[PDB]
Scaffold this active site. Sequence first.
Site, PDB file in Angstrom:
ATOM      1  N   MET A   1      28.417 -13.352 -17.891  1.00 48.14           N
ATOM      2  CA  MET A   1      28.060 -14.697 -18.417  1.00 48.14           C
ATOM      3  C   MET A   1      26.915 -14.621 -19.471  1.00 48.14           C
ATOM      4  O   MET A   1      26.148 -15.545 -19.703  1.00 48.14           O
ATOM      5  CB  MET A   1      27.772 -15.700 -17.245  1.00 48.14           C
ATOM      6  CG  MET A   1      28.848 -16.132 -16.548  1.00 48.14           C
ATOM      7  SD  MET A   1      28.425 -17.756 -15.696  1.00 48.14           S
ATOM      8  CE  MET A   1      27.061 -17.425 -14.890  1.00 48.14           C
ATOM      9  N   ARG A   2      26.777 -13.483 -20.128  1.00 47.91           N
ATOM     10  CA  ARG A   2      25.735 -13.289 -21.122  1.00 47.91           C
ATOM     11  C   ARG A   2      26.231 -13.734 -22.504  1.00 47.91           C
ATOM     12  O   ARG A   2      25.455 -14.287 -23.255  1.00 47.91           O
ATOM     13  CB  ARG A   2      25.415 -11.789 -21.266  1.00 47.91           C
ATOM     14  CG  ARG A   2      24.152 -11.473 -22.111  1.00 47.91           C
ATOM     15  CD  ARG A   2      24.046  -9.958 -22.361  1.00 47.91           C
ATOM     16  NE  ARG A   2      22.777  -9.710 -23.111  1.00 47.91           N
ATOM     17  CZ  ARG A   2      22.662  -9.544 -24.417  1.00 47.91           C
ATOM     18  NH1 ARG A   2      23.719  -9.497 -25.198  1.00 47.91           N
ATOM     19  NH2 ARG A   2      21.442  -9.372 -24.955  1.00 47.91           N
TER      20      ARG A   2
END
Lengths: 267, 267, 267
Positions: free
Chosen positions: C73-74
């Site tokens: 989720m970066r």
Amino acid sequence: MDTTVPTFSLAELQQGLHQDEFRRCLRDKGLFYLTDCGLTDTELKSAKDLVIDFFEHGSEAEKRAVTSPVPTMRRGFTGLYSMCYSMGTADNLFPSGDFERIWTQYFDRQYTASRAVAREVLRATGTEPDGGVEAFLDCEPLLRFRYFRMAPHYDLSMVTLIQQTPFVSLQAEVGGAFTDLPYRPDAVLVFCGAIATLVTGGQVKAPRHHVAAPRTSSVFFLRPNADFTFSVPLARECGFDVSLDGETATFQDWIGGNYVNIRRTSK
Amino acid sequence: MDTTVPTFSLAELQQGLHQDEFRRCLRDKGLFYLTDCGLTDTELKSAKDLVIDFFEHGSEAEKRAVTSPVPTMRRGFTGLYSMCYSMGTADNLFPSGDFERIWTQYFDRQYTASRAVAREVLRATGTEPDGGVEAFLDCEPLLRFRYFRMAPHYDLSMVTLIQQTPFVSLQAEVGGAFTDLPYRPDAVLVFCGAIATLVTGGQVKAPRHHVAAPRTSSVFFLRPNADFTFSVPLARECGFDVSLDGETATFQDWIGGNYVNIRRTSK
Amino acid sequence: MDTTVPTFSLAELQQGLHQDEFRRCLRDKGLFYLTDCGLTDTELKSAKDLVIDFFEHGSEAEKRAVTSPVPTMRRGFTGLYSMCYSMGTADNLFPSGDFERIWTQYFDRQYTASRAVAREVLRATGTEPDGGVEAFLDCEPLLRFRYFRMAPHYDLSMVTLIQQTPFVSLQAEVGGAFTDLPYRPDAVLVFCGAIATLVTGGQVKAPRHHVAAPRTSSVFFLRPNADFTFSVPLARECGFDVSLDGETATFQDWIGGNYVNIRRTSK
Ligand SMILES: CC1(C)S[C@@H]2[C@H](NC(=O)Cc3ccccc3)C(=O)N2[C@H]1C(=O)O
Ligand SMILES: CC1(C)S[C@@H]2[C@H](NC(=O)Cc3ccccc3)C(=O)N2[C@H]1C(=O)O
Ligand SMILES: CC1(C)S[C@@H]2[C@H](NC(=O)Cc3ccccc3)C(=O)N2[C@H]1C(=O)O
Ligand SMILES: [Fe+2]
Ligand SMILES: [Fe+2]
Ligand SMILES: [Fe+2]
């Protein structure tokens, strides 16, 4: 891309067959069943049977003599309304007389298969780990056998080998949706983990998986040495939310002083 | 081995009595009640009473003046449908006028008892920490008093002292099954934690414990300094799944830059 | 102190207005709405609309091309019965043709507003970070947009900016009790996080917040560089339960080799 979890024969892979199919599997799915890798159902029986006879009929003193003083599930027996038996390459705790033989041979078969597939993963992606392939693969494996639910996570291993006894509880994300992963007679299920993604510069997916709700499992984590070294910028390019100053780092730098085997996407 | 949680008098231990019984308790159980260590019920009253009068009757501004700006439960007051009051050897936050006196004396009694039992644990196992016994014990304690459920975990302390008010919610694994740990009039309950196992080379069990479902508790963690140093291979021999390059490491190396007080077996 | 979550205009703050009110807000509450900071509702529409048209109508292949190989989720897209779109200052993954433009401009507006308010927080408290203000603020932001519950936690950011679509699920502890934090037409909600507390020597509260049970959110974390350096004793004075040998440390030393964005008080 279809949503089928593929199967590969290790021997065919080692012979140079199915290169494109393998490489795309690794990039797009990051899991597969593996045949022809020395993990015949026979053998899981020998090992399964005698651990299962320790689990049900080992006395409390016999269990205690193969329990570590900290309940870390790294070596020996753990009571957990389940039981676990864990092993690695040294510092093991073995019941009895014939258990050591059986379980050392079983562990070896799984460590060999695990190194072999990882070797193919590296080859398929053109990867030379810092320090070379064989020092990378001469690592810190951990085998856990569990006998009687898992929220989605991905593995922090290079690869994870999973043998089970045969409702399909294990599922993985393939093509954006969870897919059943049933027992395969002479196959082992391989999940690529985050260290595969890391070492190959993003060429291998580390898929999320879980155990859904409605028995025994053997999970072999091939884990890197503390000193496995990688490029920090390269890690950032493939999604790793690293907090690392400077240009190279080690596994120890990244994850800390205790192995962490799994991670949730959540934070 | 029976399944009774033993009791020892600290004074008898200090006099050389019950050596075998103590040593086997540490190896096989890792918990016990401790009498004759300066923790009389009277004193828990003095401290309990005035904290409990702060918890129910301290204004929101009075509470705020003894609340840290990050809600870490390290020092001072924490609202949590429960309240906590935390202390260590310095940097404390105290209500009022007579609270500081009472609570400094209470903390001291518990830190002294904690060091004393830990001293006996080291002695019973023939352990000389790297750097010596007294520098090891001059450490980083943390006292939390909670006023009004815990999944199984083990402590990462050297020892943990627990005084309670008297259904038995607290249970621990003894002989492979959870056992009640009720309030004992002039006794404190001692759990050995993982640092006991570590420092003694595996001679002390760190038992799992939890709080079961169907009031106030005082939990004193004796925690090592950041610079506590240990043998890496030795750690691996006793079950620690360390990711540490090289031969020695510190507590900071192992656990990181923030204290972690408990751990679950799960991962 | 009253229990009202205040609002400040960034432009008024930059002009030297409401100094006392701002400083006390930071010390006693650690959250506020911020107007006049370049985050007009118009713009959230442009960005929201096209991400929402990717989320519902992007094919599985289009999504896969903007998904990282590790599900962190970066950067890029994450399926999670929700979808996320994440960004930072580089290494982004963008759909299409006009998405990059819109989302780069949106990210920039939020990074600028975030640095600006953080600059005011530093100024209001008389803080000069080690290495200076501008190197501190030239940092490691992360923007996550989520489209369709959160247990209480506090943020480990310097500040966190939150824009939402308008029952009030988001609540924060103010004056010892949870308070609604509804959508504010031309305002963004700012939470101070733990790095604000740390860098200012305890002059800023990092409040706990959660999402209660009975839609879309944009959360911008302003996160320090790995090399952000601080005083260890000073950290201990303000509640940080650090395990750090010696007198200075870095963010990396404290939190480790992977960013951690939130923390629960629990352990
Ligand atoms: C992390 C896991 C140990 S969980 C999954 C599978 N385990 C099981 O299916 C047995 C199980 C039953 C109930 C709850 C958890 C695990 C198994 O083995 N898997 C491992 C993996 O995911 O890499
Ligand atoms: C970790 C703990 C703080 S939990 C256990 C006991 N705490 C309680 O019994 C109070 C409590 C009630 C509800 C939920 C958690 C703890 C207590 O004190 N124990 C500590 C320990 O286990 O070393
Ligand atoms: C950590 C968070 C991402 S959670 C909170 C809010 N998120 C939501 O309200 C959406 C949501 C719905 C269900 C479960 C979790 C979050 C949001 O954004 N907040 C962030 C923060 O708290 O700093
Ligand atoms: Fe897994
Ligand atoms: Fe505990
Ligand atoms: Fe948050």
